[PDB]
């Protein structure tokens, strides 16, 4: 039943290497999430926000990462992008919720927060609930290579969060949840 | 394999790096322009040099993707912007030679002294004093001085630098597969690659002539009225059939005639609109003159201003301690950060200029969704035109009646309605002939059409036939009278102002049609008309992604720029200048010359 914590994890994973934490059978008192912060986005697709407490499931995962504001909507069933195509793809039959809240200070620096990486380039689009930790150089072209400088590119890409940026550019912590039944 | 268009992936890599590095360059440029210190300017220069080096290396990388194999209507434009390869194809001590030439011209223009025979130690630059002298002196002597002496101690030394600048820019442009540097400047208006929208570079010249032709009478009548109103302030110095002396035009070059307003007033007893004496009894602070500008922009539908705009823009003046450039500047820092650097002293001019800078920032927010290289005006004269149409919609006396500046009992007599409209026509008109003449002279000079030993000749010929302004003393080839202007001795394309004037009046006419305006165009404000919000935003959303002709069609409805909305703006006061000049000889004679007496 970890929810007082997964969300308030400093150094949230970046989206390319999103951190998944399993929630076993516990008190299941996640109705307290509504009393943590004014979430920018709280979108429960397969379940209803009023039916969270009474409805019961078997296993829960707390997928957490950091994205921009122009990229929170990309965390949804479908909704192509870079955060959904190459970093975090949500199945069309997603049953959990999507919880994203601004963290433009918790995760911004005036000199630049070059710590949260997102993968801009990849060969194939990610399958639902797939992780691509691998960081081998991308080809982005057709003369096989050994290092960047030609059309070959580094697959990962920093975010460059400033203590100051457009809301849609500001850092956003997203501890998505994953319900599944055996 | 991989499509040549893989430049897409390349541009995706470039855009993220460009967005981050441009933000660092702009933020460093921001905190300097508000907080000048040695460390701040050093940071700005470091960030700018890093950003320029990044553009250079990305251009070298983009050399690999030929536009011939690209077809996406947006990827090709970004590739063209990257691999334009301007001033870098030029030879090492050529672009640099010009670089030093450009710097020398900039420092001669900015740091140049002119001073009287009687006191050779009380010398003033065109910025301090010389400027004022042309705006306040209103003399014929004190104005003939500081004009010829500005062309002689500054223009003469700018002449060799400009002669080398023209040729060096000529090979710089020709190595970019152009024909001259005028063609390089017109290349911002190039539109080919778009079915239907195929604006060529020479078509810009073609249409500026075919719009100045319709600009002529409005001007000729305004020039005749100004001449008639300058023969009672300079009674024995201007012929009623000749041109206007160049030092009697309110400023150094005769660009704007707005400083001739006091001399040329339709009705001097009727005060013009000025709410500075009205919004100090309402105790407006610095914020509110912007808070009711944002209101204006949320009246038409344009969204609110971002929270990072009130908390990050210095709208309350430098603050009397740090040093702060005070030019009203809208700033699009980068990733979603739009600010305005404007030192707002409570004044009607500052109110209109705040509306101007907010129009600029609204346009920036609109095309922020576009890719980075397409984050600009669709051509040279759309962004500034949006700013000025916002200013015009703010300045209407009817707009300042929902705002409690004017009492709810006011009614501009046609008198001030001609007073204000002539005040505007001295700024708008009077620079259209000046802009067209100057940029036409530059365009010919670049293709060598104007032999060097004829430059000044042609210059002062054009001033006599196009602008209707005669030189007060004959300028042989030792002078470089155009270079005496900021945009000429600083490598700034100047036709952007002519095109921007045409665009702004087309925008105003179209937005007033969308707002269902009924009266005269100059009395029209776009406020509270959300249908004129989603008629310009259809163009504001489009940056350089779509051709500027397509953007104009989206907002105005016409493929090419039109001058009729500009004339429809001044159809009142056009009837009035036709009535006033019933005795005055409308037009001018290029033969007339002050020294010819």
Curated annotation (Swiss-Prot), chain A:
Changing residue 157 to R: In strain: Omicron/BA.1, Omicron/BA.2, Omicron/BA.2.12.1. It comes from the Viruses. Residues 113-121 are annotated as: Immunodominant HLA epitope recognized by the CD8+. Residues 68-70 are annotated as: Integrin-binding motif. Changing residue 8 to Q: Reduced viral infectivity. Changing residue 11 to K: In strain: Mu/B.1.621. Changing residue 160 to S: In strain: Omicron/BA.1. The chain holds residues 336 to 518 of 1273 of the full protein. Binds to host ACE2. RBD also interacts with the N-linked glycan on 'Asn-90' of ACE2. Cleavage of S generates a polybasic C-terminal sequence on S1 that binds to host Neuropilin-1 (NRP1) and Neuropilin-2 (NRP2) receptors. Interacts with host integrin alpha-5/beta-1 (ITGA5:ITGB1) and with ACE2 in complex with integrin alpha-5/beta-1 (ITGA5:ITGB1). May interact via cytoplasmic c-terminus with M protein. May interact (via N-terminus) with host bilirubin and biliverdin, thereby preventing antibody binding to the SARS-CoV-2 spike NTD via an allosteric mechanism. Changing residue 121 to L: In strain: Omicron/EG.5.1. Residues 102-172 are annotated as: Receptor-binding motif. This is Spike protein S1. Disulfide bonds join 1-26, 44-97, 145-152. Attaches the virion to the cell membrane by interacting with host receptor, initiating the infection. The major receptor is host ACE2. When S2/S2' has been cleaved, binding to the receptor triggers direct fusion at the cell membrane. When S2/S2' has not been cleaved, binding to the receptor results in internalization of the virus by endocytosis using host TFRC and GRM2 and leading to fusion of the virion membrane with the host endosomal membrane. Alternatively, may use NRP1/NRP2 and integrin as entry receptors. Glycans are attached at residue 8. Residues 1-182 are annotated as: Receptor-binding domain (RBD). Residues 120-154 are annotated as: Disordered.
UniProtKB/Swiss-Prot annotation, chain B:
GO terms for cellular component: apical plasma membrane; brush border membrane; cell surface; cilium; endocytic vesicle membrane; endoplasmic reticulum lumen; extracellular exosome; extracellular region. An engeneered stable, dimeric and secreted receptor with combined mutations that increase the affinity for human coronavirus SARS-CoV-2 spike protein shows potent SARS-CoV and SARS-CoV-2 neutralization in vitro. Changing residue 333 to F: Increases slightly the interaction with RBD domain of SARS-CoV-2 spike protein. Changing residue 365 to A: Slightly inhibits interaction with SARS-CoV spike glycoprotein. Optimum pH is 6.5 in the presence of 1 M NaCl. Active from pH 6 to 9. Keywords: Carboxypeptidase, Cell membrane, Cell projection, Chloride, Cytoplasm, Disulfide bond, Glycoprotein, Host cell receptor for virus entry, Host-virus interaction, Hydrolase, Isopeptide bond, Membrane, Metal-binding, Metalloprotease, Phosphoprotein, Protease, Receptor, Secreted, Signal, Transmembrane, Transmembrane helix, Ubl conjugation, Zinc. It is a single-pass type I membrane protein. Binds 1 zinc ion per subunit. Residues 1-589 form the Peptidase M2 domain. Changing residue 20 to A: No effect on interaction with SARS-CoV spike glycoprotein. Changing residue 1 to P: Increases slightly the interaction with RBD domain of SARS-CoV-2 spike protein. Changing residue 368 to L: Increases slightly the interaction with RBD domain of SARS-CoV-2 spike protein. In sACE2.v2.2; increases interaction with RBD domain of SARS-CoV-2 spike protein. Substrate binds at residues 255, 327-328, 497. Changing residue 19 to A: No effect on interaction with SARS-CoV spike glycoprotein. Its EC number is 3.4.17.23, 3.4.17.-. Chloride binds at residues 151, 459, 463. GO terms for molecular function: carboxypeptidase activity; endopeptidase activity; identical protein binding; metallocarboxypeptidase activity; metallopeptidase activity; peptidyl-dipeptidase activity; transporter activator activity; virus receptor activity. GO terms for biological process: angiotensin maturation; angiotensin-mediated drinking behavior; blood vessel diameter maintenance; entry receptor-mediated virion attachment to host cell; maternal process involved in female pregnancy; membrane fusion; negative regulation of ERK1 and ERK2 cascade; negative regulation of smooth muscle cell proliferation. Changing residue 142 to R: No effect on interaction with SARS-CoV spike glycoprotein. N-glycosylation on Asn-72 may limit SARS infectivity. Proteolytic cleavage by ADAM17 generates a secreted form. Also cleaved by serine proteases: TMPRSS2, TMPRSS11D and HPN/TMPRSS1. Changing residue 21 to R: Increases slightly the interaction with RBD domain of SARS-CoV-2 spike protein. It is an enzyme of class 3 (hydrolase). Belongs to the peptidase M2 family. This is Angiotensin-converting enzyme 2. It comes from Homo sapiens (Human).
């Amino acid at each position: 039943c970890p929810f007082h914590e997964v969300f308030n994890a400093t150094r949230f994973a970046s989206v390319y290497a999103w951190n998944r934490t399993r929630i076993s059978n516990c008190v299941a008192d996640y109705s307290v999430l509504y009393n943590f912060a004014p979430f920018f986005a709280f979108k429960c697709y397969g379940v209803s926000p009023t039916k969270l407490n009474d409805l019961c499931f078997t296993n829960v995962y707390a997928d957490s990462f950091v994205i921009k504001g122009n990229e929170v909507s990309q965390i949804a069933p479908g909704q192509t992008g870079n955060i959904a195509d190459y970093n975090y793809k949500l199945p069309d039959d997603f049953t959990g919720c999507v919880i994203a809240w601004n963290s433009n200070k918790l995760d911004s620096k005036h000199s630049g927060n070059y710590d949260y990486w997102y993968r801009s380039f990849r060969k194939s689009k990610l399958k639902p609930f797939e992780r691509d930790i691998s960081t081998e150089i991308y080809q982005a072209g057709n003369k096989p290579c050994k290092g960047k400088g030609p059309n070959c590119y580094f697959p990962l890409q920093s975010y460059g969060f400033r203590p100051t940026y457009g809301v849609g550019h500001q850092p956003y912590r997203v501890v998505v949840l994953s319900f599944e039944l055996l | 394999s991989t499509i040549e268009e893989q430049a897409k992936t390349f541009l995706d890599k470039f855009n993220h790096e460009a967005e981050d590095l441009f933000y660092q360059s702009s933020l460093a440029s921001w905190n300097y322009n508000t907080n000048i210190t040695e460390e701040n300017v050093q940071n700005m220069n470091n960030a700018g040099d890093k950003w320029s080096a990044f553009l250079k290396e990305q251009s070298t990388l983009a050399q690999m993707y030929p536009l011939q194999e690209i077809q996406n209507l947006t990827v090709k434009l970004q590739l063209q912007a990257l691999q334009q390869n301007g001033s870098s194809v030029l030879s090492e001590d050529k672009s640099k030679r010009l670089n030093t030439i450009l710097n020398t011209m900039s420092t001669i223009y900015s740091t140049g002294k002119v001073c009287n025979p009687d006191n050779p130690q009380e010398c003033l630059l065109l910025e301090p004093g010389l400027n004022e002298i042309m705006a306040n002196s209103l003399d014929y002597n004190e104005r003939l001085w500081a004009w010829e002496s500005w062309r002689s101690e500054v223009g003469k030394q700018l002449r060799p630098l400009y002669e080398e600048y023209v040729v060096l820019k000529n090979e710089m442009a020709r190595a970019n597969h152009y024909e001259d540097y005028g063609d390089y400047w017109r290349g911002d208006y190039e539109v080919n690659g778009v079915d239907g929208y195929d604006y060529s570079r020479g078509q810009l010249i073609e249409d500026v002539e075919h719009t100045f032709e319709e600009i002529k009478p409005l001007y000729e009548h305004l020039h005749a009225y100004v001449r008639a109103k300058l023969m009672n302030a300079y009674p024995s110095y201007i012929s009623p059939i000749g041109c206007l002396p160049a030092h009697l035009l309110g400023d150094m070059w005769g660009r704007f005639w707005t400083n001739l307003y006091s001399l040329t007033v339709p009705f001097g007893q009727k005060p013009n609109i000025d709410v500075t004496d009205a919004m100090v009894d309402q105790a407006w602070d610095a914020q509110r003159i912007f808070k009711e500008a944002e209101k204006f922009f949320v009246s038409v539908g344009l969204p609110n201003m971002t929270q990072g705009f009130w908390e990050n823009s210095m709208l309350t003046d430098p603050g009397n301690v740090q040093k702060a450039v005070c030019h009203p500047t809208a700033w699009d820092l980068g990733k979603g950060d739009f600010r305005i650097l404007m030192c707002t002293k409570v004044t009607m001019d500052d109110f209109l200029t705040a509306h101007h800078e907010m129009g600029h920032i609204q346009y920036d927010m609109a095309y922020a969704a576009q890719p980075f290289l397409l984050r600009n005006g669709a051509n040279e004269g759309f962004h500034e035109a949006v700013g000025e149409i916002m200013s015009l919609s703010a300045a209407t006396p009817k707009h300042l009646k929902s705002i409690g500046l004017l009492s709810p009992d006011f009614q501009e007599d046609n008198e001030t309605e001609i007073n204000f409209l002539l005040k505007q026509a001295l700024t708008i008109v009077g620079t259209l002939p000046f802009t067209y003449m100057l940029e036409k002279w530059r365009w010919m000079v670049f293709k060598g059409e104007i032999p060097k030993d004829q430059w000044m000749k042609k210059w002062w010929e054009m001033k006599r036939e196009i602008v209707g302004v005669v030189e007060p003393v004959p300028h042989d080839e030792t002078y470089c009278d155009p270079a005496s202007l900021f945009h000429v001795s600083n490598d700034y394309s100047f036709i952007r102002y002519y095109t921007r004037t045409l665009y702004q009046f087309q925008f105003q006419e179209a937005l007033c049609q969308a707002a269902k305006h009924e009266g005269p165009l100059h009395k029209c404000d776009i406020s509270n008309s959300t249908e004129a919000g989603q008629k310009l935003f259809n163009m504001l959303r489009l940056g350089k992604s779509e051709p500027w002709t397509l953007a104009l069609e989206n907002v105005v409805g016409a493929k090419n720029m039109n001058v009729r909305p500009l004339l429809n703006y001044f159809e009142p006061l056009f009837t009035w200048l036709k009535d006033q000049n019933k005795n005055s000889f409308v037009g001018w004679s290029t033969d007339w010359s002050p020294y010819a007496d």
